Amino acid sequence: GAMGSMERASLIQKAKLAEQAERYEDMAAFMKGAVEKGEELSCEERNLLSVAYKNVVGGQRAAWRVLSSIEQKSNEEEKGPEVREYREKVETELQGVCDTVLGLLDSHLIKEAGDAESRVFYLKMKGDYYRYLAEVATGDKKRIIDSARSAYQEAMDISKKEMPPTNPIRLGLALNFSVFHYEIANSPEEAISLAKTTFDEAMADLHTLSEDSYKDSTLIMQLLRDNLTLWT
């Protein structure tokens, strides 16, 4: 496509407007449109893509959790199929959005990504979208979990070789990978160890940053520390 007739620059402009109006679903469609033009994304464009879909999927994940919890409470008086039906409806939409993002990554964002920044970014995204599929999977959960792990590990390998320890995406990758270990893969010890080593290595690299870079790194570092305080 519906965005096939619009200029790439117009889609990017509209995505920024949709962000200001908090129209994340529109923002996502504009950015899908932009990606399907077939040109590589700049840093700012990758960010818009990421914000759009994280907000769309964020809303669906929160609804899903509300509904699963009502559903689980009902399996402790008989209320009919409605709770399960609606939970399945929300779940199905959630899986379609994740399938949309993973399709974009596979056609052809990841294979065209040559620079460490872009490649790490896209592999992290892939990890996160499999992680979201894993949160709702029951019967294939194992293959989904392994696809998440494999994308995260590939991104971690490149980020460790190619980026400084305070790089915000390296940090955000490690944070999300640690949440994977703790909440999805049932490995709280792996989670805690990754969070601690990530925090410590960033700490020792703060001295190299400007005041602005410093502010960006330390924000993600606080979330690592918040999780460590929760997990310990």
């Binding site: 960010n47 990421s50 914000v51 994280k54 907000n55 964020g58 996160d128 955000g172 944070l175 999300n176 640690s178 949440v179 703790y182 909440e183 993600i220 979330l223 918040d226 999780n227 929760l230 997990w231």
Partner: peptide, 8 residues
């Protein structure tokens, strides 16, 4: 619940 990296 653990916090993941926020949107951005």
């Amino acid at each position: 619940r653990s916090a993941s990296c926020p949107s951005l």
